[PDB]
Amino acid sequence: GGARVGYIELDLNSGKVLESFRPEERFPMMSTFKVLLCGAVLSRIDAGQEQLGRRIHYSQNDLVEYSPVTEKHLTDGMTVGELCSAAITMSDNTAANLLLTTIGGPKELTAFLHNMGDHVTRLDRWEPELNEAIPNDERDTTTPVAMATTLRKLLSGELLTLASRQQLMDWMEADKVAGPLLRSVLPAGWFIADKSGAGEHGSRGIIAALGPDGKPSRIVVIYMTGSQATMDERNRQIAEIGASLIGG
Template identity: 35%
Template sequence: MIPTPESTSISRRSLLALGGATTAGAALAAFSAAPALAVPTGAADAFSGGGSARMARELAALERATSVTIGVVAREHGDRRAFRYRADSVFPMCSLFKTLAVAALVQARGYDETYWSTPIPFTDADVVTDSIVLDDLDPQQATPGFLADAALRFSDNTAGNLLLRELGGPGAITAFAASLGADRTRLDRWEPDLNAAVPGDPRDTTTPDDIARLYEALLLDDAAGVLAGARLREWMLRNTTSGARMRAGLQPPYELADKTGGGSYGVVNDAGVLWRAGRRPLTLVILTRTDDPNATRNNEVVAEATRIVVGD
């Protein structure tokens, strides 16, 4: 366990960049006047990249400055050690389920060429909010591959629901996660209801530990098969939705295969695998939650958490 720090620090640049419930000035003033912060017991000083105690202190300061609870796992591939911060705490999963849905479908039907080339019809009744790709699609039909691309690269909610329908419903995600050893991940509802993120509601939740286990298994270890791993990497390396989250906290050159999610109560998530020259692949998971029903989504929290954990 990391001892309670005597002091915490975070850059003035970082605080001034933060939005959310407090203004930058108020956040800076509150942080400057705050007493030392205790590091959560879920923070582990066992990260091969070093600096775990510093990272835990800075994440605690970021939580205090933004009123956002943050969960993080960072693990280099092949290393049993990991940096863990609130890693066993429960967080809303939101659209992170879409990676699991696509993986499960490719695992089950990946080599059925007829299936992947046959369009799946849908109607106006199937179209839900935040469906940037399928909302205006005419005719209303899409192949499974098109749905997977829309769900992973653009986080299209209608595509996510149609994938769930192909799998037999949300319970298939719970079963698939459990088959890979993630027994604290569950999906109960469809889009957009699964993004309600009400504090204390166990539905549609996961933990940073579970998402790290799942994404590492799928993207690096090909746990759903070589074809599923290859297709996931192809789609997720070209993700379009994380420009203000993880990608905003990274310094090029790098390659990132990730999936974002967002919900009510200001929830913003991002999880994936990071490749950088001369380094082992890094599985990185950043989940957030608040208790404020009026909280707005603060992407900079994820970006700053990425800077803290990954550095340069």
């Protein structure tokens, strides 16, 4: 439906690319960036520059649209760990902004990425503006291969400590708001750890570590933008691309 689609699948062990389509074209990251964000936070924790338990007190004025978890803790605040859980598992937008604030914002997330060897992925804006997805706008974009390689480094490389690696995987495993995507076509008993995104201009995307027997063995990154299709159809389209990668 006019969609520009890009995807890649990696073997998690070897890092070998198994299949790709437009892997080096830029797509709006949308909420998929929230995994990289918590990656940067976990890296700071590893370095002793941040604590998982540090409580962040925020006010009504910090709340942006779609903050299902953060809107419930204006009185007592939330820990860095809780915010990352909210950002990843619920796609909480205020949580994402609060975490960006802790690391120094989008430029620092981008710097984090640069420093781990990702010179492609860039965050420029905050929630909700980063979801604008203006055609050919390079702000807040990644490529399928850059995202997949970065996800793989975060989840299986020695970039994060064992504890942080597993914490990041655990948050993604607990994703609550990606049901109509890869989860809808996954065989029973399969492990999936994912993060989805939706943006303007018919943009939709998902990043995932997944595999049979309750263990991940594959990285899958799928982005689309420019789609004329309804949300249900966009969901099915990603799901179908995913089912093809998992199957074939």
